[PDB]
């Protein structure tokens, strides 16, 4: 497996010893916040650090494209005819204290999220599609009517009844049903308002993974040891230590071999890591998309609808396309990214092989000839005097709300401005400077939307069900440029239709959607990205493969 020029796996030529201690770190300039219950945990650092303990007790294995498969802690099966998901927990699925994982532990997850007394921030609208769950969430019902137990609460089976089936239900991260268990017998006497701060969900939890946390140092570290009651393969290692390391100390920590693996390192540090002897640097395709938006209307919050009613030359398809073809994204990436940013051809990242294709063509290749010709034939005629184009007497001038974030954000933005000058479009920064992130978010997400920018950039970390509805639908508040297009609406609906229960049909729907978005050019895909992980040469069985389900049990050391 490759990801760009990176290997996804470190094929160590040396055999693993029996035992050993692996030293892992996560790069963060903020402390971790330990919370072992998925529904109550809001810290991405700790979520990753919980991996050896079961990742906050996730149930389901997937393939390398995040589609559910059988063989994890539980299986899930969908029945269209009865509008039901059936979750079957393994017979020997146990908590780390030896107690059984049961149907009730799965239901209890729902309670931690849906009962406001626990204080979860993880309720979503998608959960309202489970029969009876809204009524539980608002306190109208004492129980969740759509969740039943064919073999009772202490059995191993749970059935979840939906109002409507959704084709994304075969993808992990879909949000229509949950994928974790919580130890009800361990936590049942803790007041809901005290659950998040209880020792029992922080320093002294029960877990289901191959390792259990023997010691948690608040904000800093976990000492993991083998979980005797793990259903699967006994781990090779005797222990794993997982610690937070600061950005400023990560490179030195590799130089001194303080950590075997550091996760979450940022793109800027890669050139300092590449050259380190003693490490193999692995790479993987990210669940990420960056894109350019054009401002085309406003958002009507009361009626939950985008209205594409802004006066702007960007209402012209030829203009939107030309501004995309003018950019030099590849050249930019080649200068600055160290192969960690690669030009996007479409809005769905290539890691989703079942939902996209490299055959889809967008704006990944600069084509200034085409950009110029598009503007010509649309009546935007160039000037002798000024280097800029005019139509019905008015100059083609646009405002670019570029933002802070990338290490060369200023330089990249200026480069694009200069490319746009080459096609006779005058582009200026919003208020003559890059926008701060929090300012940018406010500007883009406060209805009805501003009228004082034309072009902006956004970037998203996508869930493993890469839903486009909450980003680009006519009803979506995150449709930042506010386009509203009958063909795109059709395309979006088709992706989530009953016909898309068929994977080949769904792939075709995702592909059409991506083609149509590129042609219409309301938005322009910019970059995909790669993540990297340095790995000490003594580590055996390390891989970034998303389909690798047993890495914590398989991983070892050669000395």
């Amino acid at each position: 497996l490759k990801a760009g020029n990176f290997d996804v796996a470190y094929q160590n030529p040396d055999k693993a010893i029996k035992g050993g201690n692996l030293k892992v770190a996560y790069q963060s300039d903020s402390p971790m916040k330990a919370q072992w219950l998925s529904g109550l945990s809001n810290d991405a650092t700790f979520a990753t650090m919980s991996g050896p303990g079961g990742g906050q007790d996730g149930l389901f294995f997937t393939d390398s494209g995040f589609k559910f498969i059988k063989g994890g802690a539980a299986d899930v099966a969908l029945d269209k005819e009865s509008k039901t998901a059936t979750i079957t927990l393994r017979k020997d699925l146990k908590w780390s204290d030896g107690s059984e994982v049961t149907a009730k532990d799965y239901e209890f997850t729902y309670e931690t999220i849906a009962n406001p007394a626990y204080g979860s921030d993880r309720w979503t609208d998608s959960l309202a599609n489970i029969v009876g769950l809204s009524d539980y969430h608002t306190g109208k019902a004492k129980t969740i009517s759509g969740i039943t137990f064919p073999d009772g609460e202490n059995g191993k089976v749970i059935k979840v009844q939906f109002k409507e089936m959704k084709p994304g239900m075969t993808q992990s991260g879909n949000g229509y049903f949950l994928e974790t268990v919580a130890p009800y017998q361990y936590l049942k006497d803790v007041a809901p308002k005290d659950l998040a701060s209880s020792p029992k969900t922080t320093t002294k939890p029960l877990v289901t993974g191959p390792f259990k946390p023997e010691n948690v140092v608040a904000g800093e570290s976990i000492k993991y040891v083998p979980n005797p009651y793990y259903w699967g393969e006994k781990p090779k290692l005797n222990s794993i230590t997982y610690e937070v390391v600061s950005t400023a100390k990560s490179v030195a920590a590799l130089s001194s071999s303080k950590y075997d693996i550091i996760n979450g390192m940022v793109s800027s540090q890669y050139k300092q890591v590449k050259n380190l002897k003693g490490y193999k640097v692995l790479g993987q395709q990210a669940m990420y998309i960056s894109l350019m938006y054009y401002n085309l209307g406003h958002y009507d919050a009361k009626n939950s609808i985008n209205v594409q009613d802004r006066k702007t030359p960007l209402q012209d398809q030829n203009v939107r396309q030309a501004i995309g073809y003018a950019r030099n994204v590849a050249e930019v990436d080649n200068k600055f990214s160290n192969g960690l940013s690669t030009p996007a051809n479409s809005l769905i990242p290539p890691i989703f092989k079942q939902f996209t294709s490299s055959s889809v063509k967008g704006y990944e290749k600069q084509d200034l000839d085409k950009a110029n010709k598009l503007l010509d034939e649309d009546g935007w005629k160039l000037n002798k005097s000024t280097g800029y184009r005019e139509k019905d007497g008015k100059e083609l001038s646009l405002v670019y709300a570029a933002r802070v974030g990338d290490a060369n954000a200023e330089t990249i933005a200026q480069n694009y401005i200069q490319q746009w000058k080459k096609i006779g479009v005058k582009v200026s920064l919003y208020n003559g400077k890059l926008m701060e992130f929090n300012s940018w978010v406010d500007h883009m997400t406060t209805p009805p939307g501003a009228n004082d920018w034309d072009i902006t950039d956004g970037s998203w970390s996508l869930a493993s069900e890469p839903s486009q509805q909450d980003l680009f639908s006519a009803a979506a508040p995150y449709n930042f440029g506010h386009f509203n297009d009958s063909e795109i609406t059709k395309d979006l609906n088709d992706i989530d239709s009953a016909k898309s229960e068929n994977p080949t049909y769904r792939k075709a729907a995702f592909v059409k959607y991506q083609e149509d978005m590129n042609k219409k050019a309301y938005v322009i895909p910019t970059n995909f990205m790669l993540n990297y992980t340095p790995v000490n040469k003594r580590v055996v069985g390390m891989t970034l493969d998303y389909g690798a389900m047993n890495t914590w049990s398989e991983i070892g050391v050669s000395s």
Binding site: T124, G173, N174, S459, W460, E465, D470
Partner: peptide, 6 residues
């Protein structure tokens, strides 16, 4: 609610 700024 699935995807995040980042």
């Amino acid at each position: 609610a699935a995807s995040a700024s980042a």
